[PDB]
Amino acid sequence: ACTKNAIAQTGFNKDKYFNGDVWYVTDYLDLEPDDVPKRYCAALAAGTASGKLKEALYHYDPKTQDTFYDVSELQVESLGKYTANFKKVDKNGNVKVAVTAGNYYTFTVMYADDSSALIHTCLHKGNKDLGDLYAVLNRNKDAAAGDKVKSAVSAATLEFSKFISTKENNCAYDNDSLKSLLTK
Ligand code: HEM
Numbered sequence: 265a266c267t268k269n270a271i272a273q274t275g276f277n278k279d280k281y282f283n284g285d286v287w288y289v290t291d292y293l294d295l296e297p298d299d300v301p302k303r304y305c306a307a308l309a310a311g312t313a314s315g316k317l318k319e320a321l322y323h324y325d326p327k328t329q330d331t332f333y334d335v336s337e338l339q340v341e342s343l344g345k346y347t348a349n350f351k352k353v354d355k356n357g358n359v360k361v362a363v364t365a366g367n368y369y370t371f372t373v374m375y376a377d378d379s380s381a382l383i384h385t386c387l388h389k390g391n392k393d394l395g396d397l398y399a400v401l402n403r404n405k406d407a408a409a410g411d412k413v414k415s416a417v418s419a420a421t422l423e424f425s426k427f428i429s430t431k432e433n434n435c436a437y438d439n440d441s442l443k444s445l446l447t448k
Pocket residue numbers: 289292299300301303304305306307308321323332333334350351352361368369371385387389392394397399
C-alpha cells in the first residue's frame with residue numbers, strides 16, 4: 265500500500281518535461297519491503313501526442329529477461345500530478361492488455377530540470393499495489409546523480425544513500441520504440 269502524498273515541484277515546467285524525449289531511471293527507492301527486484305531497469309518517454317498527454321514505459325528485469333512496454337494517457341490532478349490508466353503493448357504499440365478500471369498509476373514530478381528529475385509513483389494493478397516508488401531520472405542513461413536532484417531527494421526527507429542504482433545491470437534501451445509509443 266502507498267502512503268505518501270508526494271508534492272509536485274513548485275513552478276514545474278510541463279512542456280519541458282513532456283517534450284517527447286526519453287528519461288532513464290538511474291536510481292530507485294521502494295518504501296515497501298521487497299516490492300520490486302533489487303536489479304532492474306526502466307525508462308519512459310513523456311510528451312503530448314495530438315493534443316493528448318502521454319507516457320510510454322519500458323521495464324526490463326536484467327536477470328529474468330522479463331520485458332514489457334506500456335502506453336498511457338495522463339489525466340491532470342494538479343500541476344505535476346497525474347493519474348495514468350495504462351495499456352500493456354508490444355514495442356510497436358499493439359495492445360496486449362487493454363486499459364481497464366483498476367489498472368492505473370499516479371505520477372508526481374517532485375523535481376525536474378532539463379537533464380534530471382525526481383518522481384513518485386503509486387501503481388495500482390487489480391489486486392496489487394506496488395507501494396510508494398521514487399525514481400531519479402536522467403536524460404543520459406549513465407549519469408551519476410548531480411547536486412540538484414540529490415538535494416531534491418534530501419528536501420523530500422529521503423536519503424539518497426538508500427536508493428538502488430540501475431547502472432550496473434548492462435541494460436540497453438530501445439529509445440526509438442519509446443518515442444514512437446507516445447503516439448499509440
Ligand atoms: C519510472 C517510473 C515507473 C512507472 C511509472 C512504473 C509503472 C508501472 C506500471 C504501469 C506497471 C504495470 C504494467 C502492466 O502490467 O502493464 C509496472 C509494473 C512493474 N514495475 Fe514499474 N514503473 C516505474 C518504474 C519501476 C522501477 C524503477 C521498478 C523497479 C524495480 C519497477 C518495477 C515494476 C515491477 C516489478 C512491475 C511488475 C508488477 C507486477 O505485475 O506484479 N517499476 N510499473
